[PDB]
Amino acid sequence: HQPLIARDGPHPIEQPTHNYMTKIIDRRALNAAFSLATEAIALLTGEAL
Amino acid sequence: DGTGIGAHRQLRAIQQLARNVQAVLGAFERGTADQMLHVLLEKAPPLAL
Amino acid sequence: GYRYAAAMVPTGSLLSTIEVASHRRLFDFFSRVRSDANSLY
Amino acid sequence: DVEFDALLGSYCNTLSLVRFLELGLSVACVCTKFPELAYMNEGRVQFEV
Amino acid sequence: MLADGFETDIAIPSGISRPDAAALQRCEGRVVFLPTIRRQLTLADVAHESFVSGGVSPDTLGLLLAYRRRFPAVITRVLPTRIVACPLDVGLTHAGTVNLRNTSPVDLCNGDPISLVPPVFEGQATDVRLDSLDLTLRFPVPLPSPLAREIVARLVARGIRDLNDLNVLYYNGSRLSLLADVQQLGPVNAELRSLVLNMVYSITEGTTIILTLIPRLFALSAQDGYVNALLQMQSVTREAAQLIHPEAPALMQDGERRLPLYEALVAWLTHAGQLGDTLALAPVVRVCTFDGAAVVRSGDMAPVIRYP
What GO molecular-function term can you cite, just one (chain E) (predicted)? Predict the structure, then answer.
């Protein structure tokens, strides 16, 4: 919502203005890997205990 | 209408005025400060003369 | 073309009023409404 | 299948209600008001020096 | 037209003395030109100092040609700070009744259209000059419409002499004359072009047959009384018929399926019958009194309802 002032002629009179606006949400994503290997599976499981 | 939508659309038409009458009643006190600064440029000669 | 009743109760409040139609390409639905246009209702 | 869209918030302005007598410029006036001026022709002010 | 009419506001400046502002309240209803259909205009836009070109003031002939690009308006009420008028091409008021005032030396009858003319007459060009603002106002003269066709037919025909009397009218038993002046060579050449374009277009192949009726008209004025008072005592066709014996062309191409006299007369109504508007401006205004009288006198107001 914008403001207004008052003037004299021959300036034409301004009226109130309004603005009406939206944005699209921009979207991104992330990654992170972790990899174990073969023998570490058996130690948490219990194949080679 | 008799419905809720008919009474609802009035409140968009009353609070269009209130967002706009304050915009025009506020256009005077920001013009009083304007139309002192347009007189006091014509009561005023420059320094170098 | 967005829903005016969502803005009939505000969620938060801005602080900076600028010439808004100075920068236009930052938005997607954007309309200057001289004091009351038709399609507000 | 579950999908949805959303509106995340809507933001307004605040019209700053400015009185002229809060301004520092209001020394340079002598503000007295008329209930009528459009009924008045040329007025004047006398000075004795 | 609008629903609640349309009223402009011509602004009056700040400093105007009392013997200068009191010359506006004698101008309750006049004819005032506008360049636009805006609402906020100044007297310096209205005045004759805005009427001038770059530096060259156009004289009484070009003063016609620069009316038809402006929009004539009539003042309804002069407030001390602004002058309210109403244009003619938009719409009158709610009621459609806007009171004028005569400047003419000639009174008005009812139903007569009004095409306005510059103040051409001797002892009549009365310009209210404002000395507090350096402004002059040249008000045009409303007339009954066939007078406006007479004066332009004098002023156009007068320059055609000078590019190589005529200045006395008669209307309702009063001899009046117009002020003669040297004419600007520019706007007269606009008139000679605007005539001959509307002159040549009204001639078609069918007008080779109507020309063979000239020996019928010249033999008809010798029998019936309506035609002796039709040709004229001064006209060309009577001096044409005594020397020229025309005859029609024999065969026309595709003469079976078309009426050649019909194409001669449709084009005549739309160009040569249009000529009374192509020189002057449009007769927008006629006088329709409600309860006053049959005749509206000079120096009196007149109710007005729009007319094409």
Answer: structural molecule activity
What φ, ψ does residue E113 adopt, rounded to 5°?
-70, 160
Long-range contacts formed by B12-21: CB under 8 A, 24+ apart: B12/C4, B12/C5, B12/C8, B12/C40, B12/C41, B13/C41, B15/C8, B16/C36, B16/C40, B19/A1, B19/A18, B20/A16, B20/C35, B20/C36
Structure tokens at B39: 């007189």
**The two structure tokens encoding residue B43:** 């009561």
C32 chain-A contacts, CB cut-off 8 A: 17-19
Three-state SS for chain E is CCCCCCCEEEECCCCCCHHHHCCCCCCCCCEEEECCCCCEEEHHHHCHHHHCCCCCCCCCCHHHHCCCCCEEEEEEEECCCEEEEEECCCCCCCCCCCCCCCCCCCCEECCCEECCECCCECCCCCCEEECCCCEEECCCECCCHHHHHHHHHHHHHHHHHHCCCCCEEECCCCEEEECCCCCCHHHHHHHHHHHHHHHHCCCCHHHHCHHHHHHHHHHHCCCCHHHHCCCCCCCHHHHHHCCCCCCCCCCCCCCCCCCHHHHHHHHHHHHHCCHHHHCCCCCCEEECCCCCCCEECCCCCCCEEECC
Quick one: which of E306, E273, E66 has its CA closest to E184? E66
Query: How many angstroms separate the CA atoms of E174 and D12, rounded?
Result: 76
Question: Is D38 an 8 Å CB contact of chain E?
Answer: yes
Task: Establish if E13 touches chain D: CB-CB under 8 angstroms.
Answer: no
Task: Answer whether E42 sits within 8 Å of A12, measured CB to CB.
Answer: no
C13 contacts D11? CB cut-off 8 A = yes
Tell me how many degrees the CA angle E232-E236-E239 measures, rounded to the nearest 5: 95
The shortest C-alpha distance from D1 to chain E (Å) reads 57
Contact A4 B35 (CB under 8 A): no
Instruction: Give the C-alpha separation, D31 to A18, whole Å.
Output: 33
For this PDB entry, the determination method is cryo-EM
Structure tokens at E150: 């007479």
Residue C31: enclosing H or E segment and its boundaries? Answer: strand C29-32
| Strand-pair category, E8-11 with E40-42 | parallel
Which DSSP letter does residue A43 get? H
Q: Token pair of D48, please?
A: 């004795």
CA distance E118 to E125: 9
Q: Is E74 exposed, middle or buried (0-12, 13-18, 19+ CB in 10 A)?
A: buried
Question: Resolution limit in angstroms?
Answer: 4.2
